[PDB]
Amino acid sequence: DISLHHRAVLGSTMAYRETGRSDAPHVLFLHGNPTSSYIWRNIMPLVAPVGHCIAPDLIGYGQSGKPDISYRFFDQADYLDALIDELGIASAYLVAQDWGTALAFHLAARRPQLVRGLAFMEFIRPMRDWSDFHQHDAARETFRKFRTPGVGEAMILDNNAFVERVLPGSILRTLSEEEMAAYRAPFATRESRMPTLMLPRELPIAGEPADVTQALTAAHAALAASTYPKLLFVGSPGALVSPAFAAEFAKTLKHCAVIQLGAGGHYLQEDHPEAIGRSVAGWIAGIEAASAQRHA
Amino acid sequence: DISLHHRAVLGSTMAYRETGRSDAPHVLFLHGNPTSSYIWRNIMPLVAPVGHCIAPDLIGYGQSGKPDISYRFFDQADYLDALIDELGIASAYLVAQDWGTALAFHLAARRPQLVRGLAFMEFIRPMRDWSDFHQHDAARETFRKFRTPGVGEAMILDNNAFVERVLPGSILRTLSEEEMAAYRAPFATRESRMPTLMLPRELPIAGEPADVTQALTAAHAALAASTYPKLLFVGSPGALVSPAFAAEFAKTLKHCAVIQLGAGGHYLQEDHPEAIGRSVAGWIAGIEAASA
Ligand SMILES: [Cl-]
Ligand SMILES: [Cl-]
Ligand SMILES: [Cl-]
Ligand SMILES: [Cl-]
């Protein structure tokens, strides 16, 4: 009862997973790099009783198409918007991680009416310099290498280091070979890996690239002035988001609850699917109940 | 992280567990029979980031006092009202189970602006006859015996059967020795066990006792008219509330969502702490955000 579907969008196709009844509010689950909707498989069933769950594979990821495009942040945003409009989604809760949070922020910034509430974790923000990126020097060095011409191509295009090393390296439990197999399956060819190389090159570090830095600064400003309900999950030590940074960040926002998942790195869904799922489903039930009173 | 505190109330004393920051909305956790605030120990920490969490030990339970009172439903209600006033709790989320739910409904009926939300499970309602009680003849027979003069006294006062038999019998997992010790600590003496016997005798079954039946009937009607959000947790098969009954019951109320927990009996917090606390915290966060 989680089904997979394809729709033609722009110059390609996109796939998504869907579950829950269709008369409930839309809930869009947005993955990051280098995962797919697969990452939300144990969480969607917990949200399905209160929401119509849709979990897209980003263009170039999962079961979505592999068009010949730049795979920049703005391309990812363009294809996700086009899937959303093709599905008729005018109002939704957003649930997101990594580049999925950049996409969510940027989406809420452009369409402030759409957002019924945002649940997010391990998010991206403009980073003034490298010390603002991640929690350990080994991760900075890896991403500096990804961002280096030739070197990055060799690590990710030739050796698939993002899927084969970064991903399992930032998850606490050991993934089954079935699980890894699902994570590597979209990236069997050298060229198919390109979107996984483009994204770390789009991370806004020390003002480069400038277009994404600008876009994510505007989206963080809009997030900060937003009034919709918000839920920030955080792991210890986390990766992009330490616990102390979470508390600090949360108080630049309105209506942002901070939920502690405990021990975790960057991909929190594989370590805490139950906690995330129950938290989000309860949150939606509360927002929907409180909004029905109020509007009565 | 969870601290234990004490307050003078009505010439005696009441204990309570506390966590969260005080700038947060009050969340009042209400245990039932024969447990204490101890039963919320794995849930409260999950709710702390969004709420100023307070879990009382009812009068006669946990580390609360043991005054010479009859320990009827109305006595528990008066002592609880008094603690609430002593702690300055004027607006709260209520989280509740068993006789804590009777207390929560009754409180909400008499103080309709107090309640910001009600999360509840395995709740008590006026039961027209014994077939509306629980889901097995053997549970009906046990409480019938509790309610019978002399027989109830021997089971509970002498043998401590509510604590030693009914409690662990309606929890799936096996309690550790440390956990059982904590549940029996307040009931070492024969006299101390009186409250755990008085509450089964207060259950409203076939109009008896009539005063509690009236009180809860009226609390149930206030619950049906009420507009605050509600979150009903259900176990499979449950004890007092089956999944089937939870579904019909929710549809009588406004803005009630039902969360299915899966395998459990009467005391859900010992089998589903993580699910309950994570849901309740998300819910409170959501309601706070949506109301403002
Ligand atoms: Cl992800
Ligand atoms: Cl990346
Ligand atoms: Cl209880
Ligand atoms: Cl009882």
TrEMBL record, chain A:
TM segment ranges: none
Domain AB hydrolase-1: 25-273
Keywords: Hydrolase
Entries under InterPro entries matching the protein: AB_hydrolase_1, AB_hydrolase_fold, AB_hydrolase_sf, Epox_hydrolase-like, Haloalkane_dehalogenase_2
Gene Ontology cellular-component annotations: membrane
Keyword field contains Endoplasmic reticulum: no
The keyword Kinase appears for this protein: no
Domain of life, per lineage: Bacteria
Enzyme class at the top of the EC tree: hydrolase
Family annotation (SUPFAM superfamilies): alpha/beta-Hydrolases (SSF53474)
Described function: Catalyzes hydrolytic cleavage of carbon-halogen bonds in halogenated aliphatic compounds, leading to the formation of the corresponding primary alcohols, halide ions and protons.
Family note: Belongs to the haloalkane dehalogenase family. Type 2 subfamily.
SUBUNIT field: Monomer.
Record-given protein name: Haloalkane dehalogenase
Species annotation: Bradyrhizobium elkanii
Species classification: Bacteria, Pseudomonadati, Pseudomonadota, Alphaproteobacteria, Hyphomicrobiales
TrEMBL record, chain B:
EC numbers, comma separated: 3.8.1.5
Keywords of this entry: Hydrolase
Uppermost EC category: hydrolase
Domain AB hydrolase-1 intervals: 25-273
Active site, UniProt feature: D98 (nucleophile), E122 (proton donor), H266 (proton acceptor)
GO molecular function: haloalkane dehalogenase activity
InterPro entries linked: AB_hydrolase_1, AB_hydrolase_fold, AB_hydrolase_sf, Epox_hydrolase-like, Haloalkane_dehalogenase_2
Keyword Hydrolase attributed: yes
Recorded superkingdom: Bacteria
One Gene Ontology cellular component: membrane
SUPFAM superfamilies the record matches: alpha/beta-Hydrolases
Reactions listed under catalytic activity: 1-haloalkane + H2O = a halide anion + a primary alcohol + H(+)
PANTHER family: HYDROLASE, PUTATIVE (AFU_ORTHOLOGUE AFUA_2G14860)-RELATED, MONOACYLGLYCEROL LIPASE
Family: Belongs to the haloalkane dehalogenase family. Type 2 subfamily.
Protein name (database record): Haloalkane dehalogenase
Taxonomic classification: Bacteria, Pseudomonadati, Pseudomonadota, Alphaproteobacteria, Hyphomicrobiales
